[PDB]
Symmetry: D2
Subunit: 284 residues, 4 copies
């Protein structure tokens, strides 16, 4: 917080977190087959490791480094590797201090509901840096979904200092009292635009951590508004949005005055669609 800031887009912010965590703890290593700019020439071959293996091999490799006492951050697109990751997570649930960075344009669907696995997705340069630092420092296995569309823009102020965004905590990106709009990743910005173009007071909640979901924050917002819209760009069917709506339909139906709306991606949401949805629930 205090100190110099970078006017950074998400890629630069991730680059900052990696550089910082690596300078900070000799144990942190980066691996995989740019967000990693300058790490190699600064930390060397034994800290920045080109892994000429297939995804499972890289995963195994990262796991081996972790068992050896290191804190690996592996990049894996999962194009596939989930089988191995999910099993490790289940076992832990039932040691794996690793972070898998995976660019997203579904790896989400495959991991978001996995027990023992932490799944996070940043939405700003600020929480991209903050969440990655938190993920790296934690001892829990984490899949870090990076919305490729946010890599280049927008650019915002990012403190170069030591700060993290706590894993498992959602944030109110915009206070409002008529409608709760639960979202994450690239859609947070769309939700914020829509928030600005409607009459109703819209509270935008950015989940940040997709698993474990911060239900308290969501419940708090819905108890106030009584109206819920959930929006994400990943596949709608069976997606995270379905679980959130289901949890609200059982645990908090008494607080709703309107139908729960899900706006999500094709199985194989725009600002206008979100606006129409706000207008719709405001009828109740």
């Amino acid at each position: 917080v205090a100190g110099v800031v970078m006017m950074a887009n998400m890629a630069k912010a991730i680059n900052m977190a990696l550089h910082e965590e690596m300078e900070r703890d000799e144990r942190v290593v980066v691996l995989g087959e740019l967000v990693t700019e300058g790490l190699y020439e600064r930390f060397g071959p034994e800290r920045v490791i080109d892994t000429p293996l297939n995804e499972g091999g890289i995963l195994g490799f990262a796991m081996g480094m972790a068992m050896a006492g290191l804190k690996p951050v592996a990049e894996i697109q999962f194009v596939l590797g989930a089988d191995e990751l999910l099993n490790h997570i289940a076992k832990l649930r039932y040691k794996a201090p690793l972070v898998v960075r995976t660019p997203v344009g579904s790896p989400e669907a495959i991991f978001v509901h996995t027990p023992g696995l932490v799944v996070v997705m940043p939405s700003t340069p600020y929480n991209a840096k903050g969440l990655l630092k938190a993920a790296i420092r934690g001892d829990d296995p984490v899949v870090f979904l990076e919305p490729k569309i946010l890599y280049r823009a927008p650019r915002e102020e990012v403190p170069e200092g030591d700060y993290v965004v706590e894993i498992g905590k959602a944030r109110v990106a915009r206070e409002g009292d008529d409608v709760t709009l639960v979202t994450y990743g690239a859609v947070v910005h769309k939700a914020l635009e829509a928030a600005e173009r409607v009459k109703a007071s819209v509270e935008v909640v950015d989940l940040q951590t997709l698993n474990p979901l911060d239900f308290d924050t969501v419940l708090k917002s819905v108890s106030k508004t009584g109206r819920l819209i959930i929006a994400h760009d990943s596949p709608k069917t069976g997606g995270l949005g379905a679980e959130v709506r289901a949890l609200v339909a059982e645990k908090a139906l008494d607080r709703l005055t309107a139908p729960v709306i899900r706006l999500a991606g094709p199985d194989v949401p725009t600002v206008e669609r979100i606006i129409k949805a706000i207008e719709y629930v405001m009828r109740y």
Copy 2:
């Protein structure tokens, strides 16, 4: 319907459907690495094919037989093969007349939300036979989940004649007007027991086809009862139950007088739990 009946458990009923569909259409073939009793000695090596391949190979093999003009029924436990099946389904959605029988004790989770893929799960010897026949005759790729726990019992009357249970159609296993209890597979019987031990009139809806879900039937039942409980033995989180609840929370919240309850399996429901749930919603 008319004719001789067998007092059969689910395994015998599946055995009947296979024998019948094979006698009926020379194109139907069975493959894989007992539900298949007598087929080999009756139809031979070119109709009953032992496939010494891994799951993907068998899937590919079945697909090859289909492209060749045959109607294959392959047994695959998926212990893994989903990758290949899901892609084929997406492609079709975006030819694959095959049926994959897979014993279940999660293959469900991995397929239930797939576009272009038909997923069914029988609950009685009667619909086990009926659904399999419908699946085999159809031209759509189908995953046929067989609850291993129902293989041996219970035994019920199963016509040996020509009948099918239509794909994509849920059934009201027990008429009732106070509570809609949506379920499938082995849990249907538990729902029926619970139905008998409560004061309230419970309508048990057996989905039969998990994808595509018969939402009309579910909506019809909930419009009447105003109370919904969804129960399945597969993993609750991200499961089919989450989608159903979510669809009801958006499309039919106006018909509910009670919270939507999901009773499902550990991520890694008993008669008593269902009873407690009925009692709970009856408070609303």
Copy 3:
């Protein structure tokens, strides 16, 4: 033999064999993810099948088509699939009428020593057409290695008529009585150039079929010459050349007056190297 001829390079010759075998037998199908030019627009979607599967899936698919009574020709680079192919071959050795075309620039190493698997590699447009036709008509599983370097040139006279080059038979590409030079694929041409630039009479033997090896022809040539040079472009260590030399060192050492020379590829032969080798054995 009788009739119209095409001045064709290897790719055109393979294209001719496929077109001919497909026109000839409705059962012949082509599949995979140009040597296949015009087949689609001439035979259609059910004969020319784009298989959107991974290599194993395609292999399984081809196997499924074969079990269904068809004669598939699948293209697989093996970049992996060998595991499945080798097992099928072992099983047969210990039904699989398929042909796998695989471009080569090692799939050879992995298959050449497999029991029950036929492995062939053409060297001219003439035997490219002839061998492929023989492979397709046979009931044995065959891997057809196509030296990519020969696809475009050279061009030679290729009868469009019905002829095959028998599987399992080597050919004397050039009669000679001082040195036997065993080779195949692209190296046949290099052997022929060398043959023309030395004093000694060099007999060039083109194996054509790599498995099962035509040892009789090789023995006949070596009994006459007493000198043996074996040349191939695939990895030398553990390659086909090692087996040939070993078989000659046990079964025919009595006919040799010179050391057995192997000229082959890096584990990870030029005209000049072959010439030097001829000169060397001619010293004995």
Copy 4:
């Protein structure tokens, strides 16, 4: 050499090497899904690691531990993992200080000809201990083939002290001057029995290291005897025996007075067969 000895079979000797190398260097770790008796209760969870991954994952895991500065010994049967191992070896050839122990009853065929990969196979409790220690201490990746048939017997004197058997060096298991009998693993004992039941003086050469082959020792023996028999239990076709014979047929044909004999396993050698072979070459 000096000191206490154990009357040990091969399994006990491997158990001794592991215990010793682990006591000796904190960096040595053992992993995989008994030869490992007592290690866990003596070195603990971070040194003796149960790896719940598939073979590739374990390989990757072992590689990750190595990159982290440790010296892993992983058990992998390869039932598959070779793809990954071979690539790493090629890359090194073109860091991987790991040892993969693999029981054998073909993993040999798949690795013996790989550039940059060390492949060894012990034949006695004495060299089982010695070679494993050498493999562990070296920085080269090694596949350690353990003939399952020798695990229980025979038992022989094994010094508990610090000694290794040098990688890449064959040994003369029995001096002789009429016939060179090249062998390894379980067949060494059979060769030694045969040596005792023939008139001829048979020199038994135990390769010990299969890759890189100690050709000097083999050449030295053959220059003396002029007769060569090569025997191994792995598949004969394309096996190590083929390379040895081929190397001798080119580099040392001038020293032979008899045909080079290979006695090996079915593609899918007894004391009597070896005896007949000795008798045969003694005719020359």
